[PDB]
C-alpha cells in the first residue's frame, strides 16, 4: 500500500504520524552529571514508546515481519532520537532543545561534550541548508528503514526507500530547485545521515559505559542497548 501513495500523500502521512515533543522532569530551581544523565535517559525512554508507535505509521513498516521491525528499531532508535533532537534545535543556535523546558549549552557529563558538539554541528548544518519539515520526516523514515537493512524482505524496503527518494526530489522540485540543485541537495541530506550514524555509534558506546558504571537506565533502554 506504501507503493501506491503519491509524493504529497507520502508527506502528509509522515507529517501526520509525527510523535509529540515530550517534556523533561527538569527543575531549574536546582543546578550535576548524574542528575543530568538521569533527565536525558528518562526522556529518551518515554520517547521510545512514542517512536515505536510512530514506526508503525511509517508507510511500509507494518508490511514487515515482527522480527524485522524489532531489528530495524534496535539499530536506528538512537539515530532517530538524535535527528529529532537536532531538528528541534535548529531555531536555537549553539543550543540543544532536548525538551521545551530543557535547553542546554555545550557548557552544561564525561565524554558527552564531544557528542554535543557533533549534535550542534549537525543542527547548524540543517540551519544552513534551511531544512524543511517535509524533508525532515522523509530523512527520519529513511533512517528507520536503512540503518539495519544490511545487518524479498529487503526488496520491499528498498522499494519504499526509493519511494521516499521520489518524495524528496518532488519536494525540492516544488521549491524551485533546478535538476542539478535537486541532486546536490539530495546528496547533501543523505551524507548527513552518515554523521548521524557516527553520533549514534559514539552515543551507544557511552551509553554502555554509563551502564557498567551504574551511575540509571530503564528496562527498555537497557534491552535496546544490549542489542548493539
Amino acid at each position: 500500500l506504501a507503493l501506491s501513495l503519491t509524493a504529497d500523500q507520502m508527506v502528509s502521512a509522515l507529517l501526520d504520524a509525527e510523535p509529540p515533543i515530550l517534556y523533561s522532569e527538569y527543575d531549574p530551581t536546582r543546578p550535576s552529571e548524574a542528575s543530568m544523565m538521569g533527565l536525558l535517559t528518562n526522556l529518551a525512554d518515554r520517547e521510545l514508546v512514542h517512536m515505536i508507535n510512530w514506526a508503525k505509521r511509517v508507510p511500509g513498516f507494518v508490511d514487515l515481519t515482527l522480527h524485522d521491525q524489532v531489528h530495524l528499531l534496535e539499530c536506528a532508535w538512537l539515530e532517530i532520537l538524535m535527528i529529532g533532537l537536532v531538528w528541534r534545535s535548529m531555531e536555537h543556535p549553539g543550543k540543544l532543545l532536548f525538551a521545551p523546558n530543557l535547553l542546554l549549552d555545550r557548557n552544561q557529563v564525561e565524554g558527552m561534550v564531544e557528542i554535543f558538539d557533533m549534535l550542534l554541528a549537525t543542527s547548524s548544518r540543517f540551519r544552513m541548508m534551511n531544512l524543511q519539515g517535509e524533508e525532515f520526516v522523509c530523512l527520519k523514515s529513511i533512517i528507520l528503514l536503512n540503518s539495519g537493512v544490511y545487518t524479498e524482505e529487503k526488496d520491499h524496503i528498498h522499494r519504499v526507500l526509493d519511494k521516499i527518494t521520489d518524495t524528496l526530489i518532488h519536494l525540492m522540485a516544488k521549491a524551485g530547485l533546478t535538476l542539478q540543485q535537486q541532486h546536490q541537495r539530495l546528496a547533501q541530506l543523505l551524507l548527513i545521515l552518515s554523521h548521524i550514524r557516527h553520533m549514534s555509534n559514539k552515543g551507544m558506546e557511552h551509553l554502555y559505559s554509563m551502564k557498567c558504571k551504574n551511575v540509571p537506565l530503564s528496562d527498555l533502554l537497557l534491552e535496546m542497548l544490549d542489542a548493539h
Binding site: I52, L66, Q69, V70, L73, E74, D219, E223, M224
Partner: peptide
C-alpha cells in the same frame, strides 16, 4: 522482550 511486546500492542 519489551520492544517485542510494545510493537504488538
Amino acid at each position: 522482550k519489551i520492544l517485542h511486546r510494545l510493537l504488538q500492542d
